[PDB]
Enzyme design. Structure first.
Site, PDB file in Angstrom:
ATOM      1  N   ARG A  15     -23.531  32.636  19.482  1.00 19.57           N
ATOM      2  CA  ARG A  15     -23.347  31.321  18.984  1.00 19.57           C
ATOM      3  C   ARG A  15     -22.326  31.577  17.747  1.00 19.57           C
ATOM      4  NH1 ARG A  15     -26.807  27.163  19.729  1.00 19.57           N
ATOM      5  NH2 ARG A  15     -25.500  26.095  18.403  1.00 19.57           N
ATOM      6  N   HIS A  42     -48.198  23.066  44.081  1.00 15.18           N
ATOM      7  CA  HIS A  42     -46.694  23.105  44.178  1.00 15.18           C
ATOM      8  C   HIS A  42     -46.099  24.115  44.541  1.00 15.18           C
ATOM      9  CE1 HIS A  42     -47.922  20.417  40.553  1.00 15.18           C
ATOM     10  NE2 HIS A  42     -46.655  19.726  40.690  1.00 15.18           N
ATOM     11  N   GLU A  53     -50.527  28.202  38.710  1.00 16.20           N
ATOM     12  CA  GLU A  53     -50.723  28.316  40.178  1.00 16.20           C
ATOM     13  C   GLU A  53     -50.794  29.573  40.689  1.00 16.20           C
ATOM     14  OE1 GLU A  53     -48.871  25.146  42.405  1.00 16.20           O
ATOM     15  OE2 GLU A  53     -49.792  23.610  41.068  1.00 16.20           O
ATOM     16  N   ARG A  97     -26.814  22.021  18.782  1.00 12.65           N
ATOM     17  CA  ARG A  97     -25.524  21.666  19.281  1.00 12.65           C
ATOM     18  C   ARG A  97     -24.988  20.288  19.033  1.00 12.65           C
ATOM     19  NH1 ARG A  97     -27.497  25.377  23.352  1.00 12.65           N
ATOM     20  NH2 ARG A  97     -25.716  26.918  23.836  1.00 12.65           N
TER      21      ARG A  97
HETATM   22  O1  URI Z   1     -28.029  29.829  24.334  1.00 14.06           O
HETATM   23  C1  URI Z   1     -28.709  29.721  25.146  1.00 14.06           C
HETATM   24  C2  URI Z   1     -28.674  30.616  26.345  1.00 14.06           C
HETATM   25  C3  URI Z   1     -29.572  30.462  27.670  1.00 14.06           C
HETATM   26  N1  URI Z   1     -30.585  29.692  27.548  1.00 14.06           N
HETATM   27  C4  URI Z   1     -31.343  29.443  28.864  1.00 14.06           C
HETATM   28  O2  URI Z   1     -30.513  28.476  29.441  1.00 14.06           O
HETATM   29  C5  URI Z   1     -31.382  27.760  30.381  1.00 14.06           C
HETATM   30  C6  URI Z   1     -30.564  26.489  30.861  1.00 14.06           C
HETATM   31  O3  URI Z   1     -29.309  26.678  31.473  1.00 14.06           O
HETATM   32  C7  URI Z   1     -32.723  27.842  30.020  1.00 14.06           C
HETATM   33  O4  URI Z   1     -33.606  28.000  30.925  1.00 14.06           O
HETATM   34  C8  URI Z   1     -32.752  28.808  28.705  1.00 14.06           C
HETATM   35  O5  URI Z   1     -33.920  29.718  28.944  1.00 14.06           O
HETATM   36  C9  URI Z   1     -30.423  28.772  26.315  1.00 14.06           C
HETATM   37  O6  URI Z   1     -31.280  27.727  26.390  1.00 14.06           O
HETATM   38  N2  URI Z   1     -29.578  28.847  25.459  1.00 14.06           N
HETATM   39  O1  URI Z   2     -51.264  12.396  38.528  1.00 19.18           O
HETATM   40  C1  URI Z   2     -49.821  12.715  38.719  1.00 19.18           C
HETATM   41  C2  URI Z   2     -48.949  12.167  39.633  1.00 19.18           C
HETATM   42  C3  URI Z   2     -47.690  12.594  39.433  1.00 19.18           C
HETATM   43  N1  URI Z   2     -47.150  13.259  38.656  1.00 19.18           N
HETATM   44  C4  URI Z   2     -45.886  13.865  38.542  1.00 19.18           C
HETATM   45  O2  URI Z   2     -45.969  14.942  39.126  1.00 19.18           O
HETATM   46  C5  URI Z   2     -44.699  15.768  39.160  1.00 19.18           C
HETATM   47  C6  URI Z   2     -45.038  17.189  39.173  1.00 19.18           C
HETATM   48  O3  URI Z   2     -45.418  17.424  40.727  1.00 19.18           O
HETATM   49  C7  URI Z   2     -44.194  15.593  37.673  1.00 19.18           C
HETATM   50  O4  URI Z   2     -42.618  15.726  37.717  1.00 19.18           O
HETATM   51  C8  URI Z   2     -44.890  14.111  37.376  1.00 19.18           C
HETATM   52  O5  URI Z   2     -43.715  13.055  37.304  1.00 19.18           O
HETATM   53  C9  URI Z   2     -47.940  13.745  37.738  1.00 19.18           C
HETATM   54  O6  URI Z   2     -47.435  14.398  36.701  1.00 19.18           O
HETATM   55  N2  URI Z   2     -49.186  13.493  37.588  1.00 19.18           N
END
Ligand code: URI
Ligand code: URI
Ligand code: URI
Ligand code: URI
Ligand code: URI
Ligand code: URI
Ligand code: CL
Ligand code: CL
Ligand code: CL
Ligand code: CL
Ligand code: CL
Ligand code: CL
Ligand code: MG
Ligand code: NA
Ligand code: NA
Ligand code: NA
Lengths: 251, 252, 251, 252, 251, 252
Positions: free
Chosen positions: D221, D6, D78, D166
């Site tokens: 919050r 990836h 990775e 929420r």
């Molecule tokens: O109240 C909060 C504030 C920040 N995040 C962050 O917001 C991101 C999504 O916007 C997520 O990756 C998470 O780590 C929450 O989930 N909740």
């Molecule tokens: O064997 C496989 C082939 C495809 N995916 C897809 O690969 C993406 C990550 O590269 C994911 O969003 C998933 O839907 C897998 O997870 N496994």
């Protein structure tokens, strides 16, 4: 008025009630250009959003990122803006020897190897698609000339241990997942991916219609490398199929 | 040439059948068989009454399951041992949604696994979903018949009483897990309650067998708990006509 | 005032507060005829119901069908009509080498390998009999000349994989149950059946007195096949024993 | 010398780096890299943007994770295949305690595992705990910045909406598991919600990798006041300066 | 060979195969002195060990401490030294209005609200006593003139939240335990204690015979505080009963 | 003016103490107290022996816990009722990594919750982690004593025998859950087994109390299952010196 992550308003969608939801932001424009008047709306994090028109009706195309958590945000926010039908198109790893690279899988139910699904319904609840969406996806997939499989998909929160991959940094898989790929194979599961359990559970328990269709890009049992042209054709066919399934859902 | 352990029938008795209609109630078996040609009584033991009949020239077996996943699982296993590969469940059900009326037909697209036997075939993560061809045939048969048909999720319980959040009982008690559960399922869009589909569908989907469920609504649970007797016969007649037509659609 | 499944009224039971509950409808009349004035009340589905009289007191005999779900309906509906004590008589498969075909087992507790028990009490709750019922069953069993074993029973929602049988259509047993018979054997569990966990849990948590007694019809560890006479004697003795246990419960 | 599946980089591209800074948002990668010396763009695919830079003469990776445990787990795996052993997460967070103000900083000492990916590495009993050296470095960097710093437990959710209780949502409902959950966490002393730490900490603590999490508080919050643009901008800038200083403290 | 925690050898037990296992180290000498020739063997941590003679046969008396974890160590080490039968005597809090202070409870099964039981058998397995021990305890308790209750006991790893006590530092009970005392009351559970689930599960799954008898020292539903004489009589009664139960288990 | 139920002391008996040292064995209580000033015996009942003393002019309680989470939970609750807010556990442990030597010290950064009592305070998702200040003080005190100190995850079991995967037992059996578990934990980097930290850390982290654990290694499971009382003595003098010095650091 503007949803927190996607950066669009309800007016930006021009009345769309259907979304096509690929995982990869780079696929959004490729899907949208199969329809009329594609227009970029927004890009934030893993969420790229286009609008287009299909048979005179507005359609959204929105990427989800990898995994249930990011998918759940996009679906919620689209639903806040009036979207009620969600068509996922993605890639998958087949685990059955009879499924070939280039074939298409329409998920009839998911094995819930995720976490986000549990934030919508307890584990007992089935991760199943809307029957009309699955029906439309099967028909569209068949009309493209592809070999189509209907069946169960295993939906994992990880790419590596939850898909029982050992070629990793540690080379270990936690007890829960040791022997799991053979167990799914023997239970007739077709394929692995990472988003369907969340998508299907959250939609089936929230009054939203959803389904999943995917092209097979790899077979965990056939250790051969699929032809390049075949991979490109499968990608093009998968997005053709999902647009034709959307057409069938709009009537 | 031996009989299976519980059902008391041999492969020869089935006369080539590879499809079974599996009602719950033993009394429905002869009624279903008599909708087809050449109905023949095969055996009856415990909750298992077994007939054979012919539909468009092809043998079909009709076998009751009894109430619940445990007795259903035995019948499916033993029929599969004799070559049956497609299983069409017909049953009765209680509607959880206000709009789903007595006499309507429900075709299950997936079951909430409120049972135990399903876990003897697949872990809880696995979906209790029907074979797509069977569900498609059931929908088509139901709609072609003129019935009012609903497709969707079914809650499948190991009990009739607490697991369906019935309170008009000896204790009036429902364990914590099930308190407020009917409204939760209703809010999640679940259509109906029954007792066999989670086991049937999980067993079959994980075992290379094709299964589906269709059920006639005999009560609306937003109204009351105990089904009225007066509407049972007409709803039953409709249900069994539908399932036989669905069987016709699954042949060959 | 007629219960939905059993098709009887409270008046039909003539004041009975005790029921004998075999699994097989065909056994109901055989038990009832060991008592005085047996009368057929109803047959619907797997539920055949007789009344009879024992030492001048009314007793119900009602079949349950196979499994906890059908059993739970019969127990509930009989309790609605005033029954407070439930004596199960059944067959069982021994899993210990020292238990012979023809012996009797009185269950002191059940391994809850079912689902219906959870609809009455969470898994932590013990599936145990009423102590007076178990005591009466032991005494009756000993007085019949049988060799009697008191101990734990594994109570399964399936006949096949939950009893770790591999001689089946698929030949597979899900992970949970692989190795399970040996595990139970090493833990001292005596036998398998399919109803006791539900019965005992629902009664112990609902103010009802219950117990289980069973004749051993097979031993999973023995190659020898029991003969016809031994099996016939065991069937007859089991139902004599349960009627004598009922007599002890009624005073 | 493989390219991982990836991230699109090779081991050679990392120039010997054994430490990575892992923000969630791809757009933050370049900003963090440019706080260090000689930043170099390596690759961008999906939610994974990867840069290298030099910190006190040593190579450091910066790699975004995306939202959620699943995408995070791919990046960490990775990077570890390419020799990275130490992972410093910098993120944003929602405080749930009234005493924590917007602009404060939180260093997670343990996470409530309200995710799924952590279970792909260790059973639920296992603690989602940072490496003690990383947590120590993050506390020191955060306190040296002049911020008010809180050490404590974070609730790490697979959802932004129901798992953070929420209700301003399409359905307006929350599944039983999460009803009343914010108050329960508040009463248990939990400081904040986010969406990645349970996965990151569990996978690293069970895999021989060193990890920790630091975050600036962008919302509370429990407060109805809306923070102003300048306060948010200062908080964002402080957070990334802090994580780079924590990286400096980890270099050997 | 001297066991690590208890500090005794097999020879120190003089052939004993039965142990009486109170919780409090201070009770050990009092129980031993009800028998003949009491001999102090060892004291380490919460484990005080005596041997005595009952009708000419050696009996061990060994305290367990509070909780399943410390109990499990004592039982294991005593079993290593030849003990096969374990008679627990303890104190308990009733939760039913019909059970009075000074009554005796013989547990027929335990609600497994502990952790150590899971280290011997999965949750499905019943925490039940050996039938002979339970029978002996009932007989000894009834012969003493006490009012005796047979039934289910809730066995908790905590004294405070797991028994739904709110008079605490936080005043908080975790979700799992909110409403739990009423739930157990409605299910007919008699009492709370802290050791029986572990003891009964480990013995029933390990080839050891065990049972529990307890004097009721408080009733959670009553407002009256028992007086000093009633408590002293209840303590004395409890240990006399357990010794008489031991005598019934020898022969 | 309450007297707590098990410990047999009142708040006045503690002379203002807000910190407790909590060994397992009642016999260690006086040994710890005598390392401080003006030790006084307060009470002994069951496994609970309670002393007060003074450390740098501040009152400190010393109270034994007994073996296991259940008895520990009683002592912590009752001490908290009497005003104690910081709890320093000292105990013994078995190492499961080959490189850890008998006599080394381990400071727990998080516990694997293989107990039951922790679930009476927080659901399994919640992390069994120490207060960061207490863990920091314990590390420093251990290092300053000249000991070899390890920081990491501890597996905390409700049993000594099967939950620590000991086979030299009466039955020689370990239940499925625990078969292979020691190797599993060792491969996940877990350092050691003990019996109280999961309960203590979860209880305190979810109740507004500061806690930590330090333990002397008395056995390495790479060699054997049974420790011996002789290795105990030397490992025990240094353990109690360390915990008192950690307390001094927490009071400063
Ligand atoms: O109240 C909060 C504030 C920040 N995040 C962050 O917001 C991101 C999504 O916007 C997520 O990756 C998470 O780590 C929450 O989930 N909740
Ligand atoms: O064997 C496989 C082939 C495809 N995916 C897809 O690969 C993406 C990550 O590269 C994911 O969003 C998933 O839907 C897998 O997870 N496994
Ligand atoms: O409200 C209802 C109506 C019908 N059934 C069906 O009724 C049968 C028992 O009467 C079972 O097979 C079950 O599936 C229910 O479970 N619930
Ligand atoms: O080994 C055995 C013997 C008997 N039974 C009984 O067999 C019946 C099904 O034939 C069930 O009701 C159950 O109680 C078993 O399940 N297993
Ligand atoms: O209400 C009560 C009465 C007694 N016990 C007993 O009290 C002891 C702790 O004081 C434990 O060993 C337990 O068995 C309780 O737990 N709860
Ligand atoms: O291998 C070991 C060594 C020590 N302990 C400690 O041993 C004490 C019992 O002797 C308990 O408090 C526990 O924490 C273990 O659990 N395991
Ligand atoms: Cl995609
Ligand atoms: Cl649908
Ligand atoms: Cl039916
Ligand atoms: Cl970020
Ligand atoms: Cl660490
Ligand atoms: Cl005691
Ligand atoms: Mg580590
Ligand atoms: Na993502
Ligand atoms: Na049945
Ligand atoms: Na103890």
């Amino acid at each position: 008025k503007t949803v927190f992550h996607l950066g669009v308003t309800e007016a930006d969608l021009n009345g769309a009630t259907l979304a096509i939801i690929p995982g990869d932001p780079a696929r959004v424009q490729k899907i949208a250009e199969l329809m009329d008047n594609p227009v970029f709306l927004a890009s934030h994090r893993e969420y790229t959003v286009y609008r287009a028109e299909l048979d005179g009706q507005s359609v959204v195309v929105c990427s989800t990122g990898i995994g249930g958590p990011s998918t759940s945000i996009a679906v919620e926010e689209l639903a806040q803006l009036g979207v009620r039908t969600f068509l996922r198109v993605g890639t998958t790893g087949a685990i059955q020897p009879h499924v070939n690279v280039g074939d298409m899988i329409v998920t009839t139910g998911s094995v819930r190897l995720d976490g986000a699904s549990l934030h919508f319904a307890p584990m007992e609840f089935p991760a199943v698609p809307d029957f009309d969406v699955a029906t439309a996806m099967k028909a569209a997939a068949q009309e493209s000339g592809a070999t189509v499989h209907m069946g169960v998909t295993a939906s994992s929160d990880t790419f590596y241990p939850g898909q029982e991959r050992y070629d990793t940094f540690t080379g270990r898989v936690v007890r829960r997942f040791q022997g799991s790929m053979k167990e799914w194979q023997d239970m007739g599961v077709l394929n692995f991916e990472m988003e369907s359990a969340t998508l299907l559970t959250m939609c089936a328990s929230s009054g939203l219609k959803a389904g999943c269709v995917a092209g097979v890009i790899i077979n965990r049992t056939q250790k051969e490398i699929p032809d390049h042209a075949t991979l490109k054709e499968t990608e093009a066919r998968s997005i053709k199929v999902v647009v034709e399934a959307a057409r069938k859902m709009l009537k």
